[PDB]
Amino acid sequence: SLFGLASLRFQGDQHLLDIAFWCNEKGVSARQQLSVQQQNGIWTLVQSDEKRILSNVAVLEGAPPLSEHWQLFNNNEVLF
Amino acid sequence: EKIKLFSMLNHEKGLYYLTRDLQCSIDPHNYLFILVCANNAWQNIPAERLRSWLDKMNKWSRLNHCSLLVINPGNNNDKQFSLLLEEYRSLFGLASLRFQGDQHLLDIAFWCNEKGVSARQQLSVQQQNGIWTLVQRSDEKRILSNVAVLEGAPPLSEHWQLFNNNEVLFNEARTAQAATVVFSLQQNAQIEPLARSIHTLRRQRGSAMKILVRENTASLRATDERLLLACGANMVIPWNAPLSRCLTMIESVQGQKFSR
Ligand SMILES: Nc1nc2c(ncn2[C@@H]2O[C@@H]3COP(=O)(O)O[C@H]4[C@@H](O)[C@H](n5cnc6c(=O)[nH]c(N)nc65)O[C@@H]4COP(=O)(O)O[C@H]3[C@H]2O)c(=O)[nH]1
Ligand SMILES: Nc1nc2c(ncn2[C@@H]2O[C@@H]3COP(=O)(O)O[C@H]4[C@@H](O)[C@H](n5cnc6c(=O)[nH]c(N)nc65)O[C@@H]4COP(=O)(O)O[C@H]3[C@H]2O)c(=O)[nH]1
Incomplete structure (x- = not known):
């Protein structure tokens, strides 16, 4: 008899939002815990490249990237 | 101590009349249904009629306080699975069991009972002496391929494993569950036994x-490619395309299930 159950508990500086279950046309979620803050009356949710390969799309003769570390560029200006 | 055994005709009318037949036969209050259908029995049921039947079954279950379980052996029920997901309101639990050679994977899209609600759980259950016991996704990123496929190229990523021939590759894929298996074709003599290996890789896994x-x-040839597709292979990469085309074809099947 419920398409979603949520509770918001005050915890001093931020509120904790606990959704036991939730139904939506995009799916159903269960047992979600999140933190929200009331900033000026607004509830807002709280918040190396050695292997990454950057090459032109013409490097692979137009073929898509080899792997996740491969990123393509149409011309050698966006790549630059 | 005892249960009631019921037989129905392999037809849509049997499923449609199930409610009235059981009402004429059994008082459904505090009573459980286990509907074990034949192989691909739910393939001929249209979408709208299936939705109406599910709604009627749910209303009947609520009215009679009776629980219904349906076990459907099928291979191409992905669209049916999506339809079941769309009717999550009437439903209160959807589970799928996938055979992976040595173990079985139980995926529960959702489940609601008196002790709470769980959504999108994945567990491993094995069949030991005919008993289903839980074993207390994982290798989906991993890619298994032949050395000749890369034409000498090194592993493209950490998730890449290379094998000399398509024999130890099949042995490794026997242990793998969601890894991407890529074979290499060199001569005509490899068409049949690789086809057999693919058949095993689609039956066990x-x-x-x-x-x-x-x-x-x-x-x-075209016939050999059709045979490979029927054995369980997603698709066969033509020799004309360069290696990067093969790699992007590999990337295409990521997140896809072989429903044929
Ligand atoms: N019934 C029949 N159909 C014929 C014959 N010759 C060609 N075809 C048809 O032509 C298609 C493509 O022409 P292809 O140059 O033979 O294209 C062929 C050819 O280059 C090569 N190939 C296949 N089998 C042989 C073979 O026994 N000998 C040689 N030398 N090449 C073959 O593989 C390609 C793929 O062939 P498919 O996918 O089967 O598709 C073949 C096939 O359906 C023939 O004598 N009888
Ligand atoms: N250009 C051309 N010639 C054709 C074609 N089909 C047959 N031939 C000729 O006929 C011979 C006998 O081929 P088969 O009886 O189909 O029996 C063939 C076939 O079963 C197989 N085979 C040969 N090449 C291929 C191939 O590219 N793909 C596949 N799948 N099988 C092949 O090996 C057998 C021996 O074939 P070959 O030694 O090539 O010798 C071939 C070839 O000279 C064709 O589509 N195109």
């Missing part, structure tokens, strides 16, 4: 595993 065959030499 379910639709989660990705099976691909790279053609390195022009030694293929």
Whole structure:
């Protein structure tokens, strides 16, 4: 008899939002815990490249990237 | 101590009349249904009629306080699975079991009972002496391929494993569950036993595993490609396309299940 159950508990500086279950046309979620803050009356949710390969799309003769570390560029200006 | 055994005709009318027949036969209050259908029995049921039947079954279950379980052996129920997901209101639990050679994977899209609600759980259950016991996704990123596929190229990523021939590759894929398996074709003599290996890889391992065959030499026909597709291979990469085309074809089947 419920398409979603949520509770918001005050915890001093931020509120904790606990959704036991939730139904939506995009799916159903269960047992979600999140933190929200009331900033000026607004509830807002709280918040190396050695292997990454950057090459032109013409490097692979137009073929898509080899792997996740491969990123393509149409011309050698966006790549630059 | 005792249960009631019921037989119905392999037809849509039997499923449609199930409610009235059981009402004429059994008082459904505090009573459980287990509907074990035949192989691909739910393939001929249209979408709208299936939705109406599910709604009627749910209303009847609520009115009679009776629980219904349906076990459907099928291989191409992905659209049916999506339809079941769309009717999550009437439903209160959807589970799928995928055979993976040595173990079985139980995926519960959702489940609601008196002790709470769980959504999108994945567990491993095995069949020991005919008993289903839980074993207390994981290798989906991992890619298994033949050395000749890369034409000498090193592993493209950490998730890449290379094998000399398509024999130890099948042995490793026997242990893998969701890894991407890529074969290499060199001559005509490899068409049949690789086809057999693919058949095994599709029977022991379910639709989660990705099976691909790279053609390195022009030694293929349309009939052989159709046979490879029927054995369980997602698609066969033509020899004309360069290696990066093969790699992007591999990337295409990521997140896809072999429903054929
Ligand atoms: N250009 C051309 N010639 C054709 C074709 N089909 C047959 N032939 C000729 O007929 C011979 C006998 O082929 P088969 O009886 O089909 O029996 C063939 C076939 O079963 C197989 N085979 C040969 N090449 C291929 C191939 O590229 N793919 C596949 N899947 N099987 C092949 O090996 C057998 C021996 O074939 P070959 O030694 O090539 O010798 C071939 C070839 O000279 C065709 O589509 N194109
Ligand atoms: N019934 C019949 N159909 C024929 C014959 N020759 C060619 N075809 C048809 O032509 C298609 C493509 O022409 P292809 O140059 O033979 O294209 C062939 C050819 O280059 C090669 N190939 C296949 N089998 C053989 C073979 O036995 N020998 C040789 N030398 N090449 C073959 O593989 C390609 C793929 O062939 P498919 O996918 O089967 O598709 C073949 C096949 O359906 C023939 O003698 N009988």
